[PDB]
Structure formats: structure tokens, C-alpha cells
Design an enzyme around this catalytic site. Structure first.
Site, mmCIF file in Angstrom:
data_model
loop_
_atom_site.group_PDB
_atom_site.id
_atom_site.type_symbol
_atom_site.label_atom_id
_atom_site.label_comp_id
_atom_site.label_asym_id
_atom_site.label_seq_id
_atom_site.Cartn_x
_atom_site.Cartn_y
_atom_site.Cartn_z
ATOM 1 N N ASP A 52 1.781 1.960 4.524
ATOM 2 C CA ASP A 52 1.759 3.118 5.406
ATOM 3 C C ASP A 52 0.327 3.605 5.567
ATOM 4 O O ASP A 52 -0.460 3.579 4.618
ATOM 5 C CB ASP A 52 2.635 4.241 4.850
ATOM 6 N N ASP A 55 0.331 4.198 -1.107
ATOM 7 C CA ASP A 55 -0.305 5.505 -1.016
ATOM 8 C C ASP A 55 0.283 6.293 0.156
ATOM 9 O O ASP A 55 1.104 5.793 0.931
ATOM 10 C CB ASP A 55 -1.818 5.367 -0.851
ATOM 11 N N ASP A 71 0.876 -1.173 0.000
ATOM 12 C CA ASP A 71 0.000 0.000 0.000
ATOM 13 C C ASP A 71 0.910 1.220 0.000
ATOM 14 O O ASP A 71 1.237 1.770 1.053
ATOM 15 C CB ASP A 71 -0.943 0.005 1.180
#
Ligand SMILES: O=C(N/N=C/c1ccc(Sc2ncccn2)o1)c1cccc(Oc2ccccc2)c1
EC number: 3.1.3.48
Length: 259
Positions: free
Chosen positions: A223, A12, A10
Site C-alpha cells: 500500500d 506500512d 510493504d
């Protein structure tokens, strides 16, 4: 498949959806120049959307945001579309409509597997020199974050029993444009990218596990908090990645086969 361990990523809040750049909160947290950081983010978000509009059918597939690239693979009467004229078909804004929609995603897939290790041939130079200049301009503020996370990904991609997938909340086409451009294409096969836009990251997690089975080891590396709860309620070991030192531990734990 033959995969034994699957790493769900992830990226993003740091790479794909790097909204901390444009809001300027990134510059304040890490003590960088506000005006320069926003300018790099505004230039980036332009060259991304400029590629999706001229190569990946962003305006066509803007609202028809799927979750996986092979979702409409059932309506694809597989044909040589090197001559298929997309500007003159029945597409606008549907068994005969899903076929035109499905062809576009295969054309997007063809662009991915073709120019993912040769971006300079996709976006003709000098658009590469100006844009590779942009990387060092940004990696000088993030202390080579994308380079660092590429090491942890290639330390996984080279393992024949290990694989990595990506789960973002951007629409599939803009996410593919970033992964293509940013250089993450060598480590991410296009069949391993999921868009949690309409469905959420939990449903994208369940869709991954159903594909690879139960004999595999699923680990989540990301994160933020959206995928932390999505990885907790599915008993998947979550790997925080906030700090820069958290990445050195991820490599050191893969160097020694601790994962
Ligand atoms: O590096 C990147 N994000 N980093 C984010 C982040 C947040 C916290 C930390 S850790 C830290 N440590 C010390 C100081 C500051 N922060 O890093 C990045 C993101 C997208 C694309 C990207 O590359 C390119 C490549 C080509 C063109 C355009 C961009 C690079």
C-alpha cells in the site's frame, strides 16, 4: 534456492507504521472514534518499545540500525552466548566492537525463532490477555485487517515454491518487535525482513532480487506510493492493497493459482 515465486510485502501505512492511527486521520477516513483510536495506538507503540528495550536491545541498537539481520554475520565468531553478559562488555552508544554488535543481532534472531509462535511465553501473562484484548479492540475498527492479510500470507506460506518477504522503513529492531508481536512471525521468516530506513525501498528491492536470482517471479504487494515506483522501475508486478475488497481479490487470485 528452490523458490520459484517471491512475494514482496510493504505492510506500512496499515500495519507496521500505522501512523494513521496516531494522527487520527484513520478515524476520520473510516468514521471511527478519534479518542479511542489514538488510545489503542498509544498503548500499542508502548508495548512494542517496551519489548524492544527489554528483549531486542533497542537502546543498544538504536542508532546502529542495520538493514538485514545477517549483515554483520562476518564479524560473528559464533559462540555459545547463553552466558555472554551483554551488560558487561565493551559496548557503548571497531573489529572488537562489531563482534559485540553482531552477537546482539544473533540474540535477537534467537528470540525471534523461539517465541514467534509462543508470545505468551515471551511476554508473560497477563500481558497477553490484555494485549490480545487490544487486537479485537483495533480489528473492530479496521474490520479485521490483520486477520484478513494473514489469510493471504498463509495462503502463500504453505506453498513450497512460493515465499513472502517484508520491506519496511522502520528500523530493523522496532520492525521485528512489531512483526513478532502482531503475529506475522509464522508467515515471515526473520531472514526475509529488510529495513529500508537509510537505503530506501528500491535498494531493498534490488537486494532481494540479487539473492533469489532471475529464474524467479517477483511480485510486490503493498500500500502507498514509495514501493509502487520502486516496483515499477524494476518491472515487478505491483499489487495495490488499499481497500478491504482488494485483499479478497488477492486471496481469490491465489486460490485459483492465477499468481
Ligand atoms: O487491522 C490493522 N490495521 N488495519 C488498518 C487499515 C487501514 C485501512 C484498513 S481497511 C478498513 N476496512 C474497514 C474499516 C477500516 N479500515 O485497515 C492492524 C494493524 C496493526 C496491528 C493490528 O493487530 C494488533 C494485534 C495485537 C495488538 C495490537 C494490534 C491490526
Amino acid at each position: 534456492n528452490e523458490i520459484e515465486r517471491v512475494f514482496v510485502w510493504d505492510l506500512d501505512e496499515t500495519i507496521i507504521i500505522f501512523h494513521s492511527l496516531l494522527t487520527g486521520t484513520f478515524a476520520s477516513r473510516y468514521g471511527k472514534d478519534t479518542t479511542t483510536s489514538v488510545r489503542i495506538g498509544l498503548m500499542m507503540e508502548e508495548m512494542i518499545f517496551n519489548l524492544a528495550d527489554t528483549h531486542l536491545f533497542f537502546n543498544d541498537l538504536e542508532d546502529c540500525d542495520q538493514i538485514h539481520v545477517d549483515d554483520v554475520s562476518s564479524d560473528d565468531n559464533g559462540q555459545d552466548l547463553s552466558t555472554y553478559n551483554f551488560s558487561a562488555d565493551g559496548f557503548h552508544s571497531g573489529v572488537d566492537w562489531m563482534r559485540k554488535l553482531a552477537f546482539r543481532y544473533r540474540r535477537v534472531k534467537e528470540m525471534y525463532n523461539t517465541y514467534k509462535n509462543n508470545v505468551g511465553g515471551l511476554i508473560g501473562t497477563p500481558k497477553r490477555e490484555t494485549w490480545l484484548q487490544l487486537r479485537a479492540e483495533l480489528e473492530a475498527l479496521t474490520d479485521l485487517w490483520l486477520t484478513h492479510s494473514l489469510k493471504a500470507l498463509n495462503l502463500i506460506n504453505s506453498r513450497p515454491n512460493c515465499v513472502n518477504v517484508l520491506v519496511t522503513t522502520t528500523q530493523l529492531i522496532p520492525a521485528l518487535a512489531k512483526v513478532l508481536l502482531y503475529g506475522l512471525g509464522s508467515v515471515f521468516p526473520i531472514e526475509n525482513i529488510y529495513s529500508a530506513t537509510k537505503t530506501g525501498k528500491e535498494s531493498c528491492f534490488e537486494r532481494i532480487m540479487q539473492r533469489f536470482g532471475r529464474k524467479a517471479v517477483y511480485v510486490v504487494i503493498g500500500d502507498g506510493v514509495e514501493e509502487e515506483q520502486g516496483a515499477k522501475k524494476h518491472n515487478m508486478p505491483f499489487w495495490r492493497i488499499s481497500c478491504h475488497a482488494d485483499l479478497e481479490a488477492l486471496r481469490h487470485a491465489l486460490e485459483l493459482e492465477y499468481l
